[PDB]
């Protein structure tokens, strides 16, 4: 039982303006520790019908602990607002990094892929959660260069060995064929999402692209995958497995889930226990001088300065142990 308020934080820098609120680099007065605080106006959440997604995100963040999932330290509410105090990822979004570098080496994509697989294996097997929104923008880096997944509002809870989902949701460029078919789909949608992020990392483009979402969806449903002529055969076998359009043929589509991907020769020599204990060497270390250095966050936002109703959300509030 540790109740917290907006007064227990200093408000240092705007990290980013979200659709329904903003994310602010804050410092906890009592401890000196920095966090990213996500602040949503209740009026907005209710008017845009975001309440269910807000509560899902609260629940998944409370019920999850993993080194490559963003940790929730506190959630609390005011008369005005809902607040999530989260683990600050100083490294910014892999989207930032891949925009600057164009491609990652296969070894660098293998590292990020192993940390994503460990996170998703945990969500599916330990928590019965399907994430459904994997993409570069939700893959952040911590100060050491390890992955931190953010944005859990699109998760589905309570999904088991084979159980199915109906909600049409995700990001258009990342949607699995079985989601676009609008039949029921299972946890394998996450593995299609892995394939798309890993393809982008190693190939420097989406596997399917058109600006128009409807033609983009015809490519995802109909076009056969191609690869650049430089891509290694283990990389090409992994991406071809992950980007099978029929989820029952997909790598990770069977009852073994993530263990089938973990067994793939592209990950040969990876010790999954060592992945989890952060024993492996990040191939890129963010060059952040201090914790308030926001060089990996975009200019529009870092520059903006603001230095420092509606209902009650029953039992929203939470405080982590330790």
């Amino acid at each position: 039982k540790h109740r917290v308020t907006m007064n227990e934080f200093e408000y240092l820098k705007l990290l980013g303006k979200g659709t329904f609120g903003k994310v602010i680099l804050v410092k906890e007065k009592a401890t000196g520790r920095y966090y990213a605080m996500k602040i949503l106006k209740k009026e907005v959440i209710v008017a845009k019908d975001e309440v269910a997604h807000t509560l899902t995100e609260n629940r998944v963040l409370q019920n999850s602990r993993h080194p490559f999932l963003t940790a929730l330290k506190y959630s609390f509410q005011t008369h005005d607002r809902l607040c999530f105090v989260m683990e600050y990822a100083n490294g910014g979004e892999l989207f930032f990094h891949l925009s600057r570098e164009r491609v990652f080496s296969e070894d660098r994509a293998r590292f990020y892929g192993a940390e994503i697989v460990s996170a998703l294996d945990y969500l599916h097997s330990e928590k019965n959660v399907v994430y459904r929104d994997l993409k570069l923008e939700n893959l952040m880096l911590d100060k050491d260069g390890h992955i931190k997944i953010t944005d859990f509002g699109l998760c589905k809870e309570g999904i088991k060995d084979g159980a199915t989902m109906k909600t049409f949701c995700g990001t258009p460029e990342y949607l699995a064929p079985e989601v676009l078919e609008d039949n029921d789909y299972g946890r394998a949608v996450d593995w299609w999402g892995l394939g798309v992020v890993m393809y982008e990392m190693m190939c420097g483009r989406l596997p399917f692209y058109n600006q128009d979402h409807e033609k983009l969806f015809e490519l995802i449903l109909m076009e056969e995958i191609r690869f650049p002529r430089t891509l290694g055969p283990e990389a090409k076998s992994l991406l071809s497995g992950l980007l099978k359009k029929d989820p029952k043929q997909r790598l990770g589509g069977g009852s073994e889930d993530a263990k089938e991907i973990m067994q793939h020769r592209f990950f040969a020599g990876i010790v999954w226990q060592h992945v989890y204990e952060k024993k492996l060497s990040p191939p890129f270390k963010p060059q952040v001088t201090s914790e308030t250095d926001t060089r990996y966050f975009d200019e529009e936002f870092t520059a903006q300065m603001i230095t420092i109703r509606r209902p009650h959300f029953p039992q929203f509030s939470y405080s982590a142990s330790g």
Binding site: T19, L98, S99, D151, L154, T167, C169, P172, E173, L206
Partner: peptide
Amino acid sequence: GRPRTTXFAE
């Protein structure tokens, strides 16, 4: 570099 994307939910 593709443009930044947003999620959706129906």
